[PDB]
Symmetry: D2
Subunit: 333 residues, 4 copies
């Protein structure tokens, strides 16, 4: 009678959110701790809907077993789907995701990254954990009255800008669709890229990836920046030409950099590669610089974000069962 | 003919700033990284001025050696650790506080976010090639309540930053300034109200008999489960043994400590190759949700330039026979 | 028609070895990394055989669920943690020890050297770009005395390795084998002699009422200052609270623990995002000269192949109606 | 009257060794905690002899001040002297060092490195320190009955071989001056390089650096090795073509590698570069591989070695004062 959903890779918090928000939905929900892989795909027997996540390995064999079991929808409770062999589904079931949003989580994370690399909080941690309370080399800069250059004045950039204005930073910004009323309200100034590069003590990337923003941060543009600039990217990996970023670090143009995204993150992120070789030379090199901080696309990861993802997942499933268009469908080609 | 100054505990930019701001004064400056203790006090021979730092051990023997060497002024950068009564007017003592309000408020926000979003933990994973984010979920600050204990200048800067996050802010101080509360958009409350309602609590108040161990088993009982606590004020504001129990009980969600009630035995030094004798500190260092840093909230280029200048002004005032603004009085 | 086996706690080479050595038997194998607890016990539905590991929590509820699902055999890899009396003959239980003597002796020498020469500490420095070696001085093993407690097969292998270093070796066992002592070149001694004379002490003996807390405040008092202690035997051989005091007093120079008296709450799991409730363990983890590893002395490719084979032989014997050599008897 | 010696960078243990062993020498010894640099060089006033160490910065200005102060000998209590501006001394004083020996410390260290990388002891440490008691990915191999290939059968190689024979490894070895009696006594077999490469599960470099051993471990020779080989070098940095070592790691030819020496260690070793950029790409890349362990020329560092260095330093100084040839002189060109 009720729609039967099997969930994989569930943590206590996921379970509580699905039971809490799903109370209104008329689904019958079973929560498993294991990931969805070919070892576990036969547990989908008897279910109508499978809910998956970023650690699953949803390959051909997994897909085949779920289709044979008559699964009709695979709902990913995340924005990525690189772990799904889309080409093998063949419309045997639909696939849906949850697009990234959570703009406060991400703007807040960005400021946490700026401060962590500016003030060396990660490095201090590793020292004190080992009983080393020396602070030599950990000096940073005050943000007060420095200039933040914000690339992108969407919803994430606006939240970011309002926080940095709270630090009494001076804020300049670049966007192809500037909004002068928001600039008046938050107290920042729109400028060209050239002006932003020349004048900014810290630079954050908060703009979408298009042909024109692809590798916008590269050798040429970093030459225009101030020596010692702090760069942060929680937007998209491909906004930065990573190889050039390595040279600018070496030349000392870039004072520090924090990356929550990476141009070839698909091969690395969300996975523990701590016991295997990292084949990407540029990533392996970035990980050895004292002033590089990398994190694995975690800017979103707050309980509020997770709760909204949970809601979107339940709405995804309801829309499917009611035959509505799937706005979060992942197309199979 | 030149005034001779020997510096101990030299770190980032100390040498360049002292040289730059000390020019045109006829100073001759010797810059050591080592600390001042009885084992290095002999190096003060032939100097007019010794300039030290908070972790020096300036005990009676150290004092006697410098007095014997005829030093005239001992100037302590960033200190609160001199055995002042053994000096006995043999030389003057100066103490230059590391009061740098922007640096410290900004650091506090960096600590809140680091422990909330587990940035330090992520770093240790990704450096080792582990890109899993399991267990690293935090909370949004937006629309949460921040409880700020102390509304001096560091607290005000902090509050204006957190109001930028659109946190709701309440605060406690014995000398409230309602004009600033109206300007920054916060509300003054009692300690009991602050404990009950705050999702984040920051300590930015002076250490008195009454604030000593104000955060303790009873007060932490009144806090919300999962509260984030940060302390960049003074170590003694927190009963550290009770803090260990409140972590175990899971009352405290996460804690960042830039100060520690017995930091004088540990801070600013590398003890990575010796035993830490303090049980409580050794225990705090093994919690997943404790971040300790070594009193480094002050540590920016701008702060250090201002401290350096204040230090040199005291030295110049001494040499020109004016009052030493930062002199520690004896008698 | 196929025998169905579900594996929990799968790690390095488990899947490949079970597949390789299990071929030609008509087994159908499902391989999970998760652990077996009441929250995963339902996954055993439809299986004939469950194959678990030492950190599973096989409590009454877990047992009841597997019995309800009709499992016939629970085979525990590397265990000592099943609530055996709740089983009540509803299924058979097997326990396959992680006894692998070369792996374990070799690991022990790697632990001695790691803590002596501070290799682990160096790693954390150089990974961060710190190539200073200050504080990392060790001692030569050549001509020092090694005290080996237990001369079973793991102890014998260890002793032959340390004799290769030209260490002098003394040993304690209640069942001494003088022929092996003549062959390997060591001398049997009392515990008091071993404590007094040993620069290195390794525990490689079984846990009985008499060896329980044999290393404690009194016995460590008899040891030489700066002694290196290693334990890859059993956690309970050491009174861990006394070990904390002996570290603080500086009696113990360095200690490597592959086992811990309460390891059953911690080992084999990632607790990096939760509180460690055990005070003593949290304190041991903050000493510079403590190295703890999670019962991994066994963990080589060869050991695991042999354990895998023994596991599969028990399963095959079950299916063919022969005695299960590693069955844990009930009644 | 007595010869006056000023010592820099003294640790408690150094002091105790100099007082203990110098009791027979008739020197007057002053021990300072500070390093010798231009900030401290005027403390050499009134002394006849300066005793220095690897963290000193003995540059032109330092040299000039010591010469003006009438220093006659600079004794380095270490084997290196890259931190001395030799060209500026101009025979104003002599410079002596202590050549490396301590063969037990170094053979013992080598085995500690082999085991650390084989058994992942360093990685386990970082995990348990963080409260992670998982052992996934930490599996090693038994040494028993595997084959160790030892390049160099000098005093260090012989000690190493006797230890590994204690593990009941099979040992084969290469040396240009083989000693068949030592091979009979220790139970190993001499072989060609080609045979050693083809047959060894672990390989240790314990041979001197000459034209023929320079980059002997390179692309071509590592192609001949077994996949998964464990390589250890406590001999000299230049025995390995480091760039090729990075490619062999990536290809998975090398299973793990432990380096106590590095071909351009002069720029890095003994110094804390944890708050600055590492300009050497190859070093920065090596530091990010899971199966690379680097340590800073510490194989020697035991109390026995330090005590012998102390003795050699005192003998250095006595030989100088008595006008004997200085066998440990560092020539100034």
């Amino acid at each position: 009678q009720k729609t039967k959903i099997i969930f994989f890779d569930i943590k206590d918090y996921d379970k509580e959110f699905f039971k809490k928000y799903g109370a209104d939905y008329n689904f019958e929900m079973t929560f498993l701790k294991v990931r969805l892989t070919e070892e576990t795909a036969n547990l989908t027997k008897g279910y109508d809907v499978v809910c998956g996540f970023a650690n699953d390995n949803i390959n051909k064999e997994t897909i085949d077993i779920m289709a044979e079991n008559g699964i009709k929808l695979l709902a990913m409770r995340c924005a990525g789907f690189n772990n799904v062999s889309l080409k093998d589904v063949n419309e045997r079931f639909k696939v849906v995701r949850v697009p990234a949003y959570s703009p406060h989580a991400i703007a807040e994370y960005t400021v946490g990254l700026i401060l962590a690399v500016n003030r060396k909080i990660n490095k201090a941690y590793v020292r004190t954990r080992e009983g080393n309370f020396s602070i030599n080399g950990l000096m940073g800069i005050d943000l007060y009255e420095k200039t933040a250059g914000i690339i992108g004045t969407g919803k994430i950039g606006q939240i970011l800008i309002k926080i940095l204005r709270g630090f009494d930073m001076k804020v300049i910004a670049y966007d192809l669709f500037p909004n002068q009323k928001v600039a008046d309200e938050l107290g920042f100034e729109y400028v060209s890229l050239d002006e932003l590069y020349a004048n900014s003590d810290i630079i954050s990337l908060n703009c979408p990836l298009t042909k024109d923003t692809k590798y916008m941060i590269n050798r040429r543009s970093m030459l225009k920046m101030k020596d010692g600039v702090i760069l942060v990217n929680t937007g998209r990996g491909m906004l930065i030409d990573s190889a050039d970023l390595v040279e600018a670090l070496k030349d000392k143009k870039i004072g520090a950099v924090a990356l929550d995204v990476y141009e070839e993150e698909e091969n690395y992120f969300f996975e523990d590669k701590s016991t295997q070789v990292i084949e990407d030379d540029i990533l392996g090199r970035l990980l050895s610089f004292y002033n590089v901080l990398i994190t694995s696309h975690q800017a979103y990861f707050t309980k509020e974000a997770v709760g909204a993802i949970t809601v979107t997942t339940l709405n995804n499933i309801k829309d499917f069962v009611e035959g509505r268009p799937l706005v979060n469908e992942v197309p199979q080609n």
